[PDB]
Write a protein that binds this ligand. Structure first.
Ligand SMILES: O=[N+]([O-])c1ccc(O)cc1
Ligand SMILES: O=[N+]([O-])c1ccc(O)cc1
Ligand SMILES: O=[N+]([O-])c1ccc(O)cc1
Ligand SMILES: O=[N+]([O-])c1ccc(O)cc1
Ligand SMILES: O=[N+]([O-])c1ccc(O)cc1
Ligand SMILES: O=[N+]([O-])c1ccc(O)cc1
Ligand SMILES: O=[N+]([O-])c1ccc(O)cc1
Ligand SMILES: O=[N+]([O-])c1ccc(O)cc1
Ligand SMILES: O=[N+]([O-])c1ccc(O)cc1
Ligand SMILES: O=[N+]([O-])c1ccc(O)cc1
Ligand SMILES: O=[N+]([O-])c1ccc(O)cc1
Ligand SMILES: CCCCCC(=O)O
Ligand SMILES: CCCCCC(=O)O
Ligand SMILES: CCCCCC(=O)O
Ligand SMILES: CCCCCC(=O)O
Ligand SMILES: CCCCCC(=O)O
Lengths: 309, 309, 309, 310
């Protein structure tokens, strides 16, 4: 029996008791709606912020919707956080990760820009990546419409968003935006293919994210397993920016995040590796249902502050 | 053509111009004196503190000399830093690392207890470990002579002291002292055998610590390559305490520290890996000759404060 | 405050940062190794020469080790330099003054024979003098092992070696060797007792040679203050050979050197008195750490060439 | 005693003794001055041939001071300039008595030499000579157009009274700098400390060229107060003395005065070369034909000057 916190185990028991249907079983509208409902019920409420503003920027296939969060209406030049939500590149949007974005903006006292990237299966790989990249470049250019000047960007994201974080840092590393990536924060990222990993076999069912969902997401997104924009473990780590990798000890894709932090050490890159003990995948968005997960996010915040100086 | 900082390059040029003998070509006391002079002449002066006191604790061979450093005349229960110097378990002493110890005490605002462990070749392996373990367990016991109640210990050390840091944390992990290891800070540690590593071949000559010096230390200390008290990469990493591993990009034993941080990630343990760019082995003790290394030490201190809360 | 050169001040600041134990707090082997390490790091490297050879000569206690230095593989009859190292008659050896000897041989284009005389406290006064005298008389005899005929001898030495320089020149003046002393070069010598001098009070601490070291050397050597072989100011100056006296403006024993040159003028003898401005005792052996001291040694060399005609 | 005397030196002294000529007191000033001109004219080596031997003059405190420039070179780089003050007790000597010595110093140093025709006692008593030596040295140190070469520094030099003037000038320029520093001073058998009461004056009072009788005669004419450091520069502040070469003679009645000065410089931590020429007298610099070994003594002073400058 792997270690599980009591608060985390009750939540898994409640999900099992509630016994909802799989992503395969639901329409795309219902599956998307169930993800909204899960974070709506499970996450702490949104922080009150001076700024919660819809924006958009030009993208390779039309405008990309954005949402700006800032505890301040007016601020000095500084790093800007560019956030990419999880959901296998199929589900989630600006609302599923809204409260988490308000928490990051409140606790860091930095602006956060969340990206409403194109979703599969309607828009398969590499749509999401291209929009995450374009939106990050746009923020990094300190456009008038952002309302604050960016000295640097901080890519951050959960799960598929952690994948996007790593891919965007690699793309801006090869072709710089107007300011550097000063820190990346991949949270339970997919970096290496989870297929064949010990974590995926150990946590395949009953740990919030399932092997069933992972196969559902894989079929929708259609990323080539040889493409570094799909599986960024395959990219060049020799100039990776300062990194914080956070994983969960019960995550089926835990070993994917281990793999990435090991590759950064192997390449001589600075990295904070935090493996949250006795919690699952999604821990950043279940901070009311599993209250100890607020402490986990706060450890990531403390690491981010240290790594920015 | 590896990256070298200008101040670091000037220092390596001065050493090369000196063209001194190898440690093995010197008498044993001339080898010890050469390291006293290197650190004495290259390091920043001691910080002024309220408390710098010589004391001793029982060990398996007899008394183990200790030095207490504290910026405060008196303090309540808190973590106590237990420091083990470098020098291949052959050279160094309480004076070679005294200034660095005052700086750790000043910047952390925690008490530091430095250990004058027994040296090889007079006291081969595992004498240094026995003494570092006994002194750390003694500090952890909150003895009245120290006047500083320990809620926790923080093993820290450079090079051989980084080796001792990891071994001590393993031994206390397996048979606890009166309080836990709350953080360990191996700085350019020997964890895996450096023989056959790419870093040892790249940086064998001209980077402060040499392959000749490593061979000299190995002949004197006589650690069995199969004994986890000699090569702690062989130890059980599954319950390792929170860790900061700091390396130098030009260190012949750099890959040993990369190996250890990678082993902690592989085991799901929390770790900060910092690889200082364009500096050598010994960067903690050359902070006057190579002024940019002060900022390197300050990064370790910032990581320590984050990982303690 | 007294005038100090910026390069000299930077070296005194490094010694103050080091804050070593005193010579008396160390073992004899440690005290000796500390001097090796000081000159090893502080002096310019050895010049390359055609001849650097170890030999020995008979003395009153047994064989005296010698080292011959010569820029030329073969040379005709000429003066030979007979060098005696400093170190209070307690520390120093053929290696501590080696580089300086290679420099004197390179810049003078004359052969140099350094004397490894017996040291206190194991061999108290007048052991050092007996050996320096026997070696100088031996060199003056043009022995076939030397491979170079002496037309004359040039005693030279620093500190205790400058004491020995003067004593040896007095002993050979009273009972000639096979060839005369044609020039003597006492460098920061002890001629008159430093105890009670104004320079000893002014420069007792922080100017390389300390009053504590002087007292340490006095206790080991045990020269009687009435014996002219310990305090050669007490000797007969009426037939002193041509002399160069070099002192340092910051030397605790500076006034001893002033006293000797004054005694030579009083007796009508030819003397060059050079007092190096803004440097300490040991300036001859710190020519890498304090680069301006190379020019001080070159002034002594120019005076030597002028006085040899 | 029987002090050591070189055979050539002793031959010169015995020839002077055989002449049994009058004292400075038994002669008129004009006779004393012409007698010294004749002595040096026979006893010194001849003038070296130089590119430049030129009369110049500079303003002084009591009117124009006559000077003579000696240079081996018509045109030279900026460098030190030697400022020379002749001996003769501040009563006798002139530009001509020390002319050949000047040409020799210019030829062997390959530096320009400016000799000062300072005002003589008893017509111009102390401090006239000193005020003229100081004015001329300051004028040379200003690198005036009329000098024809740039001074980077000055080198006071002089024999006997002129060694006295050398030290006093160095002290005056030390307290109130000229446009360039004194880079070296070369007092040759100087009067620094009062010779009265010295062991050398008693030993060498008669028969060694300079006599106690002549010393009394000069003292009477010059009238310097024994407490005035411009008269007796042993009394001045040595703490910032420039690099010095003190040359004395072993048979000089004022030898001990020169010893006293070189000792005071060592006592003050100043760089000094002390050369005491063995078996020769006072005025060895100007008897170099009568006593050929004295050429070697001058050449040692030259070698010391090159070492102390270079
Ligand atoms: O993608 N995800 O992280 C998921 C997917 C399904 C679910 O029920 C919870 C989380
Ligand atoms: O959503 N996710 O975290 C995923 C989705 C697909 C996959 O292959 C691995 C992880
Ligand atoms: O969620 N994700 O990060 C994914 C999903 C599918 C895939 O092929 C690669 C990555
Ligand atoms: O052990 N060390 O770190 C060393 C050893 C030798 C040396 O010259 C410098 C540093
Ligand atoms: O310095 N060290 O850490 C060492 C030295 C020798 C050895 O065999 C193992 C480790
Ligand atoms: O001093 N050191 O860090 C060492 C000593 C020995 C060795 O095998 C490796 C490293
Ligand atoms: O004798 N000496 O020159 C010394 C002795 C000791 C020391 O630390 C420095 C110089
Ligand atoms: O080593 N030294 O230069 C010394 C040693 C002893 C003493 O009394 C004076 C000077
Ligand atoms: O170093 N020295 O020259 C010395 C040392 C001791 C002493 O009594 C006299 C002279
Ligand atoms: O001419 N001289 O050299 C003299 C003249 C007078 C005197 O008191 C001493 C020396
Ligand atoms: O010739 N001199 O140098 C003299 C002459 C007289 C005197 O009072 C002082 C010095
Ligand atoms: C097999 C995977 C379960 C967790 C074991 C580990 O921490 O590597
Ligand atoms: C060959 C080892 C030197 C540096 C290459 C690296 O960072 O892995
Ligand atoms: C008190 C001793 C220090 C130096 C003063 C001098 O040069 O005589
Ligand atoms: C200048 C004419 C000579 C006068 C000399 C004298 O008064 O003795
Ligand atoms: C005053 C007697 C002359 C010679 C003695 C000496 O050289 O001091």
């Amino acid at each position: 029996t792997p270690f599980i916190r009591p608060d985390m185990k009750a939540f898994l028991e409640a999900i099992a008791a509630m016994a909802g249907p799989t992503l395969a079983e639901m329409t795309l509208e219902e599956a998307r709606a169930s993800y909204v409902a899960l974070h709506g019920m499970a996450d702490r409420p949104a922080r009150e912020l001076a700024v919660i503003r819809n924006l958009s920027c030009p993208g390779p296939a039309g405008d990309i919707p954005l949402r700006l969060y800032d505890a301040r209406e007016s601020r000095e030049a500084g790093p800007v956080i560019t956030f990419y939500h999880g959901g296998g590149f199929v589900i989630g949007d600006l609302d599923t990760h809204h409260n988490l974005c308000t928490e990051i903006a409140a606790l860091m006292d930095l602006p956060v820009v969340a990206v409403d990237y194109r979703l599969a299966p309607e828009h398969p790989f590499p749509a999401a990546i291209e929009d995450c990249e374009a939106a990050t470049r746009w923020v990094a250019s300190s456009p008038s419409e952002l309302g604050r000047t960016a000295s640097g960007v901080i890519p951050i994201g959960d799960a598929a968003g952690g994948n996007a974080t790593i891919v965007v840092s690699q793309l801006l590393g090869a072709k710089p935006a107007d300011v550097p990536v000063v820190l990346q924060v991949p949270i339970f990222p997919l970096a290496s293919d989870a297929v064949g990993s010990a974590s995926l076999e150990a946590f395949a069912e009953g740990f919030v994210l399932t092997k069933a969902s992972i196969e559902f997401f894989d079929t929708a997104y259609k990323a080539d397993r040889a493409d570094p924009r799909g599986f960024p473990i395959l990219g060049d780590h020799t100039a990776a920016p300062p990194t914080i990798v956070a994983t969960a000890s019960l995550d089926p894709i835990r070993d994917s995040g281990r793999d990435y932090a090991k590759a950064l050490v192997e390449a001589g890159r600075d990295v904070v590796y935090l493996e949250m003990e006795g919690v699952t995948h999604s821990f950043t968005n279940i901070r009311a249902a599993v209250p100890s997960t607020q402490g986990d996010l706060e450890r990531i915040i403390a690491a981010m502050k240290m790594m920015l100086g």
